[PDB]
Every structure is written in structure tokens, then in C-alpha cells.
Design a protein around this ligand. Structure first.
Ligand SMILES: CCCCCCCCCCCCCCCCCC(=O)OC[C@H](COP(=O)([O-])OCC(O)COP(=O)([O-])OC[C@@H](COC(=O)CCCCCCCCCCCCCCCCC)OC(=O)CCCCCCCCCCCCCCCCC)OC(=O)CCCCCCCCCCCCCCCCC
Ligand SMILES: CCCCCCCCCCCCCCCCCC(=O)OC[C@H](COP(=O)([O-])OCC(O)COP(=O)([O-])OC[C@@H](COC(=O)CCCCCCCCCCCCCCCCC)OC(=O)CCCCCCCCCCCCCCCCC)OC(=O)CCCCCCCCCCCCCCCCC
Ligand SMILES: CCCCCCCCCCCCCCCCC[C@@H](O)O[C@H](CO[C@H](O)CCCCCCCCCCCCCCC)COP(=O)(O)OCC[N+](C)(C)C
Ligand SMILES: CCCCCCCC/C=C\CCCCCCCC(=O)O[C@H](COC(=O)CCCCCCC/C=C/CCCCCCCC)COP(=O)(O)OCCN
Lengths: 459, 57
């Protein structure tokens, strides 16, 4: 794992010692190179995970997440360098440094062998994200958003810290392999109930679970474009990865401790999808869509079947790509017209045709058109839920309809009709923006050909 | 034939010959508790270092 990690660290002084006009070029080139090297973790043994050393290991659950992180960094650099043009050299280097530190923390968190190291890195991701949001955020509301993002997260994660140190005192280890091989059932007692809650609530608030989701519209809407990209594509998946890891010590209690979280996630799926139908802000709509998708992932993890875990992995990856693409698409128009309101600019297909094609493809993967991997994940989760109880189809069926509705609503409102007469500063699409969209989209389509790579450990 | 002792003589510490046996336990002491065993052996480095959560040294 050292081969991936050291170069990422190297990226730091490479950008601090670069000429003022070459920072973006250098960072993008070597980020792409790092992504290529990482691509080699997808070779998986089968029966067990690849254990590089005592400290790091890679899984089939882990490999897809790492490749997505490393691939997301150059895209964030492409998306950032436009609105950061007026910035001083030192502040541009500081912004790139924040992004690099975030990538470094993320890679380590996914591959840490034991929970305490996972916890420390999973929490260290908070600092660069908060700095990005509050320092480079466009609006006044960013300060409030930063506080919401911090406090919601820490209120969940500190009980997890207490629970983890208690578990290592009683078991003797927090190493994930030892944790798995020496697993013993959790009795049904008040102590075990609160241990379960303390082990679960941090990852629940990271997802986010419905009702503990209020930080996400704030933080995802008030952040700069790269902040939003990394918040939706990767940082939401920390909760899913951590839950998939931690639920091995929680059996057989999960059988009934999962009921309220399943109820919240299914009904709130319906709720956030309906909310997307009456939204005046375009980033707000994409944020709530992310919430709806992660509710599906929460259900999949709580019901604890091989098909549900496979579907959850596929949906996490597909959501990460699609949501980042949608945020970038919204940001291009925002850059044009300097407002987030969805009905301000209309009929953009008449003015920007290729960007309208990108819009259509992103909207089609958001509603999970077959045979995209979005539908693969959603279908696997829906089947597992059907096995869990046949009545889930009603909720699942309803959600599919509302998602199609708001996806095509967004597409029709922004691209179709007639253009607003007054706005006359809509310039042709830049090569940078088109290439950013293609680099989001091509990987998703390519993934359909080889579905097993994003499927996970259960496969 | 009595000679008055000179200055400084009655305050001498002198020796006494006696048949009285020297008392063995004039304090009536109990038996002292046993000490703790002791430190012994060669010092080997701690197995697997410190063993703090994730540290390998
Ligand atoms: C099924 C057909 C098979 C054809 C064989 C060849 C296909 C090669 C295409 C490769 C992938 C396409 C790349 C997508 C980005 C588009 C790039 C672009 O900007 O175009 C500029 C280019 C230049 O045109 P222009 O004059 O300059 O102006 C363009 C304007 O912007 C506006 O111009 P426009 O209005 O014409 O828009 C461009 C176009 C492009 O926009 C798109 O949306 C194209 C992408 C399709 C939808 C993507 C998400 C849906 C999930 C499906 C995932 C499948 C991926 C499989 C693996 C693919 C590997 C990359 O939009 C559409 O035409 C409407 C799209 C509706 C498609 C609905 C089909 C649903 C699924 C069909 C079957 C899928 C499974 C195949 C096997 C099934 C079992 C046998 O235009 C084109 O070249 C048109 C693209 C061709 C249409 C492809 C649609 C079907 C292909 C789907 C994937 C291929 C599967 C191959 C496996 C073998 C079968
Ligand atoms: C000039 C370069 C040079 O002389 O390097 C020679 C030195 C020779 O290495 P070696 O002992 O032959 O290689 C053994 C393996 O690396 C195998 O390494 P090891 O098993 O001997 O690891 C030593 C151990 C103890 O090492 C440490 O505690 C310090 C290592 C840096 C910790 C990471 C944060 C700073 C970056 O590492 C850990 O316990 C990992 C925990 C570190 C994370 C601490 C918690 C906060 C993380 C930050 C968030 O290599 C390095 O110093 C590489 C840079 C350090
Ligand atoms: C808005 C989103 C927030 C996040 C959602 C958090 C969800 C947390 C809810 C926790 C799920 C259930 C908790 C415990 C499981 C059962 C609870 C209890 O009511 O069940 C009965 C328990 O009996 C009684 O109900 C006692 C509990 C009643 C006192 C709790 C107060 C509940 C009021 C609701 C307050 C809201 C809590 C959340 C705050 C936001 C079962 O009978 P019994 O077999 O005997 O007890 C089993 C435990 N044994 C085996 C050790 C004996
Ligand atoms: C952003 C919002 C997130 C909010 C999350 C809050 C809930 C977190 C889960 C519960 C937190 C505290 C759990 C304690 C950590 C686990 C430690 C443990 O398991 O030890 C238990 C101890 O269990 C406890 O003491 C826990 C009692 C609760 C004390 C603090 C109460 C705080 C509020 C509790 C309810 C809220 C939890 C769910 C709320 C979710 C958020 C809405 C058993 O050990 P022993 O003492 O040795 O018992 C057996 C030997 N006789």
C-alpha cells in the first residue's frame, strides 16, 4: 500500500515547489498517474483480502473505493481551476494542498487494518473539508454550513470512540481480521443495545440517515465545486464502508435493532425524493437525490445478505460518479449566470447542445437506466429487500417512480423550452468542461462491461 | 578513705558485668511481614513493542 501512498504525499512538495503558472498542469498530470498505479489493486485473491502489511490491507470492498478517490482528485482539479483564477499563488497552492491531504486521509482510512486507525483517519477527513467549505465557499451561509457539517459528525463519532476502546478492553484487539475470526454473538441486554447504537450512529450520520440529514443540503450547497464533488462522491461512502465493516461484531442483535433505521430509510427515501420535486435551487435538488440514494444503501446494509451487500457496493460506486457529474454540470451554468435558481436559465439546449447531451446522460444514469451499474445496485438491493419482506416492493416501486419524475423534471426545466431573453452572456462550452463531463461519464459506461469489479467481497 | 570524684568523672559511660541474660525481644515485636519477592532475570525487549492500538513498535 506504500507504493500508492508515498507518491500522493510527494504531490505535496511537488505543488509547493512548482512555478506559479504550472501548478494545475503538474497536479493534474501526477494525480492521473497515481490513479493509474492504484488501478492495480483490483486484482483480488478470492477467498481472502490482500494483506500488504500489519497496518494496511485491501479488499474487494476497498479496491473500488480507492480507485474512485484517486480518480476523483484530477477531476476536482479540472473543476476548480476556473473559479480560482483570480486567486494568489499561495492560496491556490493551499487549496490544492487541502485536496491532496484529503486524498491522503481517505486512502489510509479505507485500508487501515484496525478500527482505531480507521477512526482517526475517518475523523481527520473533517479538517480539510471544513477548511475548503468555509474558506472558499461563495456565500455567507457557508459558515453556518461548516458548523452543521462538523457538529452533526462529531456528535455521532465520539460515542463510537468510547465504544471502540471499550471493545478492545474486553476483546483484546481491534484488528479487523482478529475481530472477524473471533466473533461471538451479542446478547440481548441494555448494555449491548447501547453498544450497538454507539457502534452504528456515527456511520448513520455519515450516510446520512433520514432525519439526521439536515447538514447535507447546507454543506453540499454552500461548498465550492470540488468540495461538493468530494462530499458527494466519497465522503458519504465512509459511512457505508464503516457500517459494512462494523456489523460483523453486532450479530445477532441487528436482527431487531435495525427496524427503526429501516423504517426511517424507506419512508425518508420517499420523503427526500418527493422533496426534490419542489426545489427552487438546482444544487439543493442534487443533494436531496444523494440522500435518497444513500437511504437505499442503508437498507441494503441493515438487512445483511450477500445480494444486499453486493448491491450496496455497486450503488455506492455508481452514485459517486453520477452525483459528481451532476454537481459539475450545475456548476457550469452557475459560472455562466451567477445564480443557483433553476428557472433562471431555460432552454439551454438551444444554446449549448453538447452540454445538453451530457445533461441527458447524467439524468439517465441518475434514474438507473439498464444496464447501467446504478440499476445493477438498485435491483440487487430491491431483490434482497423483497426476500426480507414482500411488502418492500411498494416502497421501492414508489421511489423508482419519483426518481424518474424529478430527474426528468430537472432536465426539462434547465434544457428545454425557450431561453430566457435577457441573459446574453452564455458563451460556448469550453474544452475543459466537456472533458470533465466525459471523464465522469466514460468510466461509468465502461464499468457496465465488467460488473464484478465493483460488486465487492461477497461476489 | 573516701576520695571525692573529680570534675567530669561521675558522668562517664562505664561498663557493667552482669549475670542477667540479655533480653531477646524487649519490644515484644510481632513477626515482620514477608517482603515482595524481588526483581530477577535478564531484560528482553517487550513482545511486539508497545502494543498501543495500531503501533507496531
Ligand atoms: C444500443 C445501440 C448500439 C449502437 C452500437 C454503437 C454504440 C457506440 C456508442 C458508445 C457509447 C456512447 C457514448 C455516450 C456519450 C455520448 C458522446 C457524444 O457526445 O456524442 C457526440 C456525437 C457527435 O454528434 P454531434 O452531431 O456532434 O452532436 C451531438 C449532440 O450533442 C446531440 O446529439 P444526440 O441527440 O444524437 O445525442 C447523442 C446520443 C448519446 O447520448 C447517450 O445517451 C448515449 C449513451 C446511452 C445512454 C447512457 C446511459 C444509459 C445506461 C446504459 C449503459 C450501457 C453501456 C454499455 C457499455 C458501453 C461502453 C462505453 O444521445 C442519444 O442518441 C440518445 C440516447 C438514448 C440511448 C438509450 C439506449 C438505452 C440502452 C441501449 C442498450 C445498452 C446495452 C447494449 C447491449 C444490450 C444487450 C445486447 O454523437 C454521437 O456519436 C451519438 C452517440 C451514439 C448513441 C449511442 C446510444 C446507444 C449506445 C449505448 C452504449 C453502447 C453499447 C455498446 C455495446 C454493444 C451493443
Ligand atoms: C530519509 C528517509 C529515511 O531515512 O527512511 C528510512 C526508513 C527505513 O524504514 P524501515 O524501518 O526499513 O521500513 C520498515 C517498514 O516501513 C515498516 O514500518 P514499521 O512497521 O517499522 O512502522 C513503524 C511504525 C512507527 O512509525 C511511526 O510511528 C512514525 C511513522 C509516520 C507516521 C505517519 C504520520 C506521518 C507521515 O509505524 C506505525 O506504527 C504506523 C502508525 C503511524 C500513524 C500514527 C497515527 C497518526 C497518523 C497520522 C494521521 O524509512 C522511512 O523512514 C520512511 C518514512 C518514515
Ligand atoms: C430522527 C432520527 C434519529 C435517529 C434514530 C435513533 C433510533 C433509536 C431507537 C432504538 C431502537 C430500539 C431501542 C431498544 C430496543 C427495544 C426498546 C424497548 O421499547 O423494547 C422493549 C423494552 O421494554 C420497555 O419498552 C423498556 C424501554 C422503555 C424506556 C425507553 C423510552 C422510549 C421512549 C422514546 C424516546 C425516543 C428515543 C430517541 C431520542 C431521539 C422490549 O421488551 P424487553 O424484552 O423487556 O426488553 C428487551 C431488553 N432486555 C432484553 C434487556 C430486557
Ligand atoms: C449527531 C447525532 C448522533 C447522536 C448519537 C447518540 C447515540 C450514540 C449511541 C449511544 C451513546 C452512548 C453509548 C455508550 C458507549 C458504549 C459503551 C458500552 O457499551 O458500555 C456499556 C455501558 O452502557 C452505558 O452505560 C450507556 C448508557 C447511556 C449513557 C449516556 C446516555 C446518552 C443518551 C443515550 C440515548 C441516545 C442514543 C441514541 C441516540 C441517537 C441519536 C439521535 C456496558 O458496559 P458496562 O458498564 O460494563 O455494563 C456491563 C457491566 N456491568
Amino acid at each position: 500500500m506504500l507504493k500508492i501512498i508515498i507518491p500522493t504525499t510527494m504531490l505535496l512538495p511537488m505543488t509547493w515547489m512548482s512555478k506559479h503558472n504550472m501548478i494545475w498542469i503538474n497536479a493534474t498530470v501526477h494525480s492521473l498517474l497515481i490513479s493509474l498505479i492504484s488501478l492495480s489493486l483490483l486484482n483480488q485473491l478470492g477467498e481472502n483480502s490482500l494483506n500488504f502489511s500489519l497496518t494496511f490491507f485491501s479488499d474487494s470492498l476497498s479496491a473500488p473505493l480507492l480507485v474512485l478517490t484517486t480518480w476523483l482528485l484530477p477531476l476536482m482539479l479540472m473543476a476548480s481551476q476556473s473559479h480560482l483564477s483570480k486567486e494568489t499563488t499561495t492560496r491556490k497552492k493551499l487549496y490544492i494542498t487541502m485536496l491532496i491531504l484529503l486524498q491522503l486521509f481517505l486512502i489510509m482510512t479505507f485500508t487501515a487494518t484496525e478500527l482505531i486507525l480507521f477512526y482517526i483517519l475517518f475523523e481527520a477527513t473533517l479538517v480539510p473539508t471544513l477548511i475548503i467549505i468555509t474558506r472558499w465557499g461563495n456565500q455567507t451561509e457557508r459558515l453556518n454550513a461548516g458548523l452543521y457539517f462538523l457538529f452533526y459528525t462529531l456528535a455521532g463519532s465520539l460515542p463510537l470512540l468510547v465504544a471502540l476502546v471499550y471493545i478492545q478492553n474486553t476483546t483484546g484487539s481491534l484488528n479487523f481480521l482478529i475481530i472477524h475470526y473471533w466473533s461471538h454473538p451479542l446478547s440481548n441486554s441494555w448494555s449491548n443495545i447501547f453498544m450497538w447504537l454507539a457502534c452504528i450512529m456515527a456511520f448513520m450520520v455519515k450516510m446520512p440517515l433520514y432525519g439526521l440529514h439536515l447538514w447535507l443540503p447546507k454543506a453540499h450547497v454552500e461548498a465550492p465545486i470540488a468540495g461538493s464533488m468530494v462530499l458527494a462522491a466519497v465522503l458519504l461512502k465512509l459511512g457505508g464502508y464503516g457500517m459494512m465493516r462494523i456489523t460483523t461484531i453486532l450479530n445477532p442483535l441487528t436482527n431487531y435493532m435495525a427496524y427503526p433505521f429501516l423504517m426511517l430509510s424507506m419512508w425518508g427515501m420517499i420523503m427526500t425524493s418527493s422533496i426534490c420535486l419542489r426545489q427552487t435551487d438546482l444544487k439543493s435538488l442534487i443533494a436531496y437525490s444523494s440522500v435518497s440514494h444513500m437511504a437505499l444503501v442503508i437498507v441494503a446494509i441493515m438487512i445483511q445478505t450477500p445480494w444486499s451487500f453486493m448491491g450496496a457496493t455497486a450503488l455506492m460506486i455508481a452514485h459517486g460518479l453520477t452525483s459528481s457529474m451532476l454537481f459539475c454540470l450545475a456548476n457550469t451554468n452557475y459560472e455562466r449566470v451567477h445564480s443557483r435558481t433553476m428557472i433562471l436559465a431555460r432552454g439551454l439546449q438551444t444554446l449549448l447542445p453538447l452540454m445538453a447531451t451530457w445533461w441527458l446522460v447524467a439524468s439517465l444514469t441518475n434514474l438507473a437506466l439498464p444496464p447501467s451499474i446504478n440499476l445493477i445496485g438498485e435491483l440487487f438491493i430491491i431483490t434482497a429487500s423483497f426476500s426480507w419482506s414482500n411488502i418492500t416492493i411498494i416502497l421501492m416501486g414508489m421511489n423508482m417512480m419519483i426518481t424518474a419524475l424529478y430527474s426528468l423534471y430537472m432536465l426539462i426545466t434547465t434544457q428545454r423550452g425557450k431561453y430566457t431573453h435577457h441573459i446574453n452572456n452564455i458563451k460556448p462550452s469550453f474544452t475543459r468542461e466537456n472533458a470533465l463531463m466525459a471523464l465522469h461519464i466514460l468510466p461509468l459506461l465502461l464499468l457496465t462491461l465488467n460488473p464484478k469489479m465493483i460488486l465487492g467481497p461477497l461476489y | 578513705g573516701w576520695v571525692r570524684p573529680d570534675l567530669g568523672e561521675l558522668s562517664k559511660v562505664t561498663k557493667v558485668k552482669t549475670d542477667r541474660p540479655l533480653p531477646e525481644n524487649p519490644y515484644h515485636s510481632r513477626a515482620r511481614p514477608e517482603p515482595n519477592p524481588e526483581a530477577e532475570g535478564d531484560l528482553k525487549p517487550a513482545k511486539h513493542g508497545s502494543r498501543l492500538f495500531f503501533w507496531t513498535m
